[PDB]
């Protein structure tokens, strides 16, 4: 069961968007 309301998921698309946010600084 979902004991944590704030439980969410993370995948490769989060990585790419983050590496992009860093290149643009």
């Amino acid at each position, epitope marked *: 069961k979902e004991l944590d309301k704030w439980a*969410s*998921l*993370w*995948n*490769w*698309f989060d*990585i*790419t*968007n983050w*590496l*992009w946010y*860093i*290149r643009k600084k």
Partner: antibody
Amino acid sequence: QVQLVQSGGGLVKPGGSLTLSCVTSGFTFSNTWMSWVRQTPGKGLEWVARISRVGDGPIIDYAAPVKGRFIISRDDSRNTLFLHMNNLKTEDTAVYYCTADEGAPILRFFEWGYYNYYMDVWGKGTTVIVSS
Amino acid sequence: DIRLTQSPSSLSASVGDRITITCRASQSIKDYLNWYKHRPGEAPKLLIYSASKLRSGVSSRFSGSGYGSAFTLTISSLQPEDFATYYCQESYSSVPMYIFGQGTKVDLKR
């Protein structure tokens, strides 16, 4: 163990509509990008559409020959990928494959943000025949 | 307009042979290439992704290499379980095209 159960394929007349479904299991459906790929017997493979996680927008992309007629959607609560096909045409006759996709992030600095998109797991396919 | 041409479109070979399928590209796509296998009675299967990365589960016999506009797929020690058709797929187009090559049928030499 991962499997992609496809259904909803069969016979249909030109100009008709049909909805394909792909019930998944063995992985986190809500965290995975999905695509449809079709193959006309005698020809090669042709990417149809893709849909991302709901939280990502979702981001949806269609191939040119189907844009305006096909609609890709997903139901996370039931782990089902859909493809609503409208105004079907004889050119649409093909085997339609369900796919679970992944993205390989590019680690080169000037390519940070870009990724290689590939089809990780394919379903066994479903036949759609357009005939009068 | 990004095209992919595989060479050969069909060539023969016997069990325990070394084959090299080539995927020529109209434009430089770096390492945004992937390889798939498809047998008419089963679902297609991913072999190599991002030019030369082996997907987990595929045997070490399959190998991919190349960078730019030309690539290769090598299958050392051809096994009978892999007489099938192979496709290369690109993901470099800013427009999500995901073009596939025409395919390469691996036949039993005779």
